[model samples]
Target: MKMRKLVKDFGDDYTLIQDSQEVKAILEYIGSEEEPHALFVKVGDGDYEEVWGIDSFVPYNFLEAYRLK
Candidate 1:
């Protein structure tokens, strides 16, 4: 029940995604875009789960750096 940050590779933006399928869905959602990127993190524990977009929270800078490369 851990929370995680899913960074989508378009800009310095991200999404909060849970499980592999959610990740896949996000990828598919952005599938038309070129070289869409993403990343995740285990923030904490709880059933506070779901897929949230850019306005969900503040994105991590380090992840953005990786996405750029």
Candidate 2:
């Protein structure tokens, strides 16, 4: 997804995800499971950031240019 579209659609409360696997690891660390039709967001800075998921549904490959808007 284009960055502009992501921001326009979801706003600035979220961020575009670069590494899905990394996000997944955070989810596991937090005792969360990956859900279909869900998006992940970063809650802090750098590697220490806590990852969380939302109910927003987008294409799976949307991860190609994921945004946490």
State each model's CA lDDT, in order. Answer: 0.36, 0.45
Could you give candidate 2's per-residue lDDT for residues 3-65 as a string of tens digits? 323223444565545455665665566565554234445455554343334435443434332
- Quote the RMSD, in angstroms, for model 1: 11.4
TM accuracy, model 1: 0.27
Q: In TM-score terms, which candidate is top?
A: 2
Clashing pairs in 2: 14-68, 14-69, 15-67, 15-68, 16-66, 16-67, 16-68
The TM-score that candidate 2 achieves is: 0.37
Worst 10 residues of 1 by lDDT: 47-56
Candidate 2 at 12: error in angstroms? 1.9
lDDT of 2: 0.45
Candidate 1: residue 10 lDDT (0-100): 32
